[PDB]
Design a protein around this ligand. Structure first.
Ligand SMILES: [Zn+2]
Ligand SMILES: [Zn+2]
Ligand SMILES: [Zn+2]
Length: 178
């Protein structure tokens, strides 16, 4: 197994996947690394199994159909994995914890949102459809763009949203378009 966490790229107290060489901090993995379970298989491995069991699940989909899906176990897992892919980018640090807003010439968002809030909401099964999870994730970046206006820091929102959107299209097999 790797000697660093797959998500944050640091050493520490690492749990090792039994079916692949990745390793994780306990609360870096999503869901948090399960207490017992020998063998244990990481989220990467569990996602690859879904695909292998249903090869047709990789054919293109429309985003509007994906969003309306109910959050059954496989869609819950897909959203957990998509969240974890965002945390995998170091620039996620800016969007992880609860923000606050006191900048001359700007007003804070009406509905603040952040990654750890989405993480809690997934863990507590608060989303009934994929749409709920995707709306809260997109709201993180939209809030940031609106608040930071012409400051160059707005670009961090564009960057991390691009990581989100690319991974969304991959994990949910969204039909490729020009
Ligand atoms: Zn970690
Ligand atoms: Zn694995
Ligand atoms: Zn099948």
């Amino acid at each position: 197994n790797s000697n660093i966490c797959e998500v944050c790229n640091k050493w520490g107290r690492l749990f090792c996947c039994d079916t692949c060489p990745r390793s994780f901090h306990e609360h870096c993995h999503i869901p948090s690394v399960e207490a017992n379970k020998n063998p244990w298989s990481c989220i990467f491995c569990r996602i690859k199994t879904i695909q292998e069991r249903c090869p047709e699940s990789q054919s293109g989909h429309q985003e509007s159909e994906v969003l309306m899906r109910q959050m059954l176990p496989e869609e819950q897992l897909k959203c957990e994995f998509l969240l974890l892919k965002v945390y995998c980018d170091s620039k996620s640090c800016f969007f992880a914890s609860e923000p606050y807003y006191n900048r001359e010439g700007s007003q804070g968002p009406q509905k603040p949102m952040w990654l750890n809030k989405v993480k809690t909401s997934l863990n507590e099964q608060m989303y009934t459809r994929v749409e709920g999870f995707v709306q809260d994730m997109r709201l993180i970046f939209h809030n940031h763009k609106e608040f930071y206006r012409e400051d160059k820091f707005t670009r961090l929102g564009i960057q991390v949203q691009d990581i989100f959107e690319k991974n969304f299209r991959n994990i949910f097999a969204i039909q490729e378009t020009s």
